[PDB]
């Protein structure tokens, strides 16, 4: 019995854009949530539906991990029931959300002195998203190209600094429980 792949979920060398947001599933492993809670690197650790201290002794069916790069002013939009450019057009959370939102500053890693335009967000769409929807589009909007680049830079303020964010959306089906907390010797 082993520990979960949370090492490469959080310490990956390249996170995807917010519009093409990455998603992976952990399936059978024992997950140590309390080490992530007691880390000194996370700026925000919000949880909805489940308490993060009780989370180490709750068993689920399977756990997802949605990782992408967002601006500093826009981490507030990753919450159940908010609206904005990314909460509508890029990543939508359900109202009855049962997961946790983890984020941290990454100005020393993701920004570039000449400008880093390798992260994209959807500026235009005809309608907002259903919860946990993903799209990739290229067609011209009824006037524009919907994808636009951020332009991160270390000189820029905290609202314009790149923030890497990971969303752990737990599930509970009628399948047997696999992802349990570490039982204590």
């Amino acid at each position, epitope marked *: 019995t082993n520990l979960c792949p949370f090492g490469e979920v959080f310490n990956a060398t390249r996170f995807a854009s917010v519009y093409a947001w990455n998603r992976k599933r952990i399936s059978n492993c024992v997950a140590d949530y309390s080490v992530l809670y007691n880390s000194a690197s996370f700026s*925000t*650790f919000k949880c909805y539906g489940v*308490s993060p201290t009780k989370l180490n002794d709750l068993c689920f069916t399977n756990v997802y991990a949605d990782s992408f790069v967002i601006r500093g002013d826009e981490v507030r939009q990753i919450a159940p029931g908010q609206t904005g450019k990314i909460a509508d057009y890029n990543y939508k959370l359900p109202d009855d959300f049962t997961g946790c939102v983890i984020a941290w500053n990454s100005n020393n890693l993701d920004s570039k002195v000449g400008g880093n335009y390798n992260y994209l967000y959807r500026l235009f769409r005809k309608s907002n998203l259903k919860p946990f929807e993903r799209d990739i589009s290229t067609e011209i909007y009824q006037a524009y190209f919907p994808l636009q680049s951020y332009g991160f830079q270390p000189t820029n303020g905290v609202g314009y600094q790149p923030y890497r964010v990971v969303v752990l959306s737990f599930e509970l089906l009628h399948a047997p429980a696999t992802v349990c907390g570490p039982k204590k010797s």
Partner: antibody
Amino acid sequence: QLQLQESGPGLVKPSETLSLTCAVSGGSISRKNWSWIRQPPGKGLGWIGRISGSGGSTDYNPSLKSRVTISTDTSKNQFSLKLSSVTAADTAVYYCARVAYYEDDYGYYYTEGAFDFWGQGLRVTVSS
Amino acid sequence: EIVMTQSPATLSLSPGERATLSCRTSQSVSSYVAWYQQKPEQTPRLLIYDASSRATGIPDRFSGGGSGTDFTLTISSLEPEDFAVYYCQQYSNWPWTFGQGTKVEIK
């Protein structure tokens, strides 16, 4: 509960060094961010610099960075402020503060620079 | 440097009335503004963080709002305690700058 109290000399002669020490009590200095805040008499608040609780991530005000060194001493659970070549215009009330942090039952959140907990204020006078 | 200018220098006002204050920045700080209250010769107290959120143990009549370069602090009903000096802060860029201060003066 968390409490901050300053310690230092009330009278500092010019062209010498200045030392202050904020004794954090009721809470651990680690995993937080701490700052030194001045206030001249009859003037608004000013900012000296900040330090991280763990790792020593340290930043200064650009107008005073050639004269200030800020250090963290987690063995005694306290942090200190040092200045050099103080003039007569440096007379101020010095506060030590914690950069805000709100822990709820449903997780926590680190503020990017608001100061929730403050010290009592130690009045430093400079005269020859 | 992001200078922080508060437009009412002295707020002549009566108790129990509406109060309004202003904070205008040189450039955009993106809603990273805190509000403080300072009794004379006493410790400043944080009221608002992130320009729209009340601090822990703050009365409900304190409210802040705004974004960009316009930030306002509104007190719905005064007390005989809340005639003091109010300060406005930014922390978007690294020289963190406070305001010059605005005074609530009793009519």
